[PDB]
Amino acid sequence: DDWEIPDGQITVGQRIGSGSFGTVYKGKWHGDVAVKMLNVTAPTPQQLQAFKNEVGVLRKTRHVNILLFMGYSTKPQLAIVTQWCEGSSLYHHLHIIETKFEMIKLIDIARQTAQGMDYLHAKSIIHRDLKSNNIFLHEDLTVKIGDFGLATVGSILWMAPEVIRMQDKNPYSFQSDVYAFGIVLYELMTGQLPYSNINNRDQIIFMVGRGYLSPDLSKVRSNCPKAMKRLMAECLKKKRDERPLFPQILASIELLARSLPK
């Protein structure tokens, strides 16, 4: 059972980026893989706890829409190993290379993302950092959600007001995840990052926090169905308790997706 990987088995290739506490590379281990390494010398005791948490959470997950955890290693450097997703993150498609998807496809990405979140929530995992950067579109047709510095039982911008204005012990909850999901529905349906006409991050954080600013839902593609626009507003509720949980979101998308081809 134990998912540890003996030194030297794993080969490290292209540096590709960063993620919650570490650098990400393309590697090879029984095929090619994603490797998240924390590559210092002595590991922090705090990062030691952070590393052991993502691993703990990942080895709890087995689902198409969740980035497949494959293994970990400690020697030489602490490293998580997951499947390689060819293609790119949803963020990358939408805001960098500008892949223009179609509504049927965009709705599908929405459903699959909703799918993995229900699973996550069913097994009592809270992501606390859902955003299009963390949604990889593998072979350009399957969504894998994947970054897990988070809880069981700054990218702004996807943060609910409650999270923004850290007033109380635990702001993070199922509803905050639901909120983040809402911003992703926004990016899919508008093709934009929200608040693109404010050029000041502080002002963005201050106002979302006080409930002065909210995503401008009038910006959505005209062929985006009514029910989808309707669903987004519900997800983006300023009041935590006023948001629907993921089962309900999933039934919503499934319904509108079914009566869409026309």
Ligand X SMILES: Oc1cc(Nc2c(-c3ncccn3)oc3cnccc23)ccc1Cl
Annotated binding site for ATP: 16-24, 36
Minimum CB distance to ligand X, residue 181 (Å): 18
- The helix/strand/coil state of 33 is strand
With CB under 6 A, what is the number of residues at the site for ligand X? 15
Q: Does 82 bind ligand X (CB under 6 A)?
A: yes
Choose, by CB under 6 A, the member of 24, 50, 160, 253 that binds ligand X. 24
Choose, by CB under 6 A, the member of 85, 106, 183, 189 that binds ligand X. 85
253: which residues sit within 8 A by CB, 6+ positions away? 107, 110, 111, 114, 228, 231
Candidates 83-91, 167-175, 226-234, 250-258; binding stretch for ligand X (CB under 6 A) = 83-91
Tokens of 130: 């859902």
The C-alpha angle with vertex 180 and arms to 127 and 222, in degrees rounded to 5, equals 145
Of the residues 108, 118, 129, 147, only one is catalytic, namely: 129
Q: Which one, 132 or 175, has the nearer CB to ligand X?
A: 132
Candidates 11-19, 121-129, 160-168, 213-221; binding stretch for ligand X (CB under 6 A) = 11-19
Q: Does 57 bind ligand X (CB under 6 A)?
A: no
Radius of gyration of the chain (CA): 19
Q: Which one, 63 or 165, has the nearer CB to ligand X?
A: 63
Distance in angstroms (rounded) separating the CA atoms of residues 150 and 129? 8
For 238, list phi and psi in degrees, rounded to 5.
-75, -30
129 is catalytic: yes
Count of C-beta atoms within a 10 Å radius of residue 214: 15
73: which residues sit within 8 A by CB, 6+ positions away? 4, 5, 6, 7, 9, 10, 79, 81
159: which residues sit within 8 A by CB, 6+ positions away? 176, 179, 180, 208
Choose, by CB under 6 A, the member of 29, 51, 72, 84 that binds ligand X. 84
Candidates 15-23, 42-50, 102-110, 123-131; binding stretch for ligand X (CB under 6 A) = 15-23
Residue for token pair 């570490």:
22
Q: Does 147 bind ligand X (CB under 6 A)?
A: yes
Q: Does 19 bind ligand X (CB under 6 A)?
A: yes
Choose, by CB under 6 A, the member of 4, 13, 16, 203 that binds ligand X. 16
Residues in touch with ligand X (CB under 6 A): 16-19, 24, 34, 36, 80, 82, 84-85, 89, 136, 146-147
Q: Which residues are catalytic?
A: 129
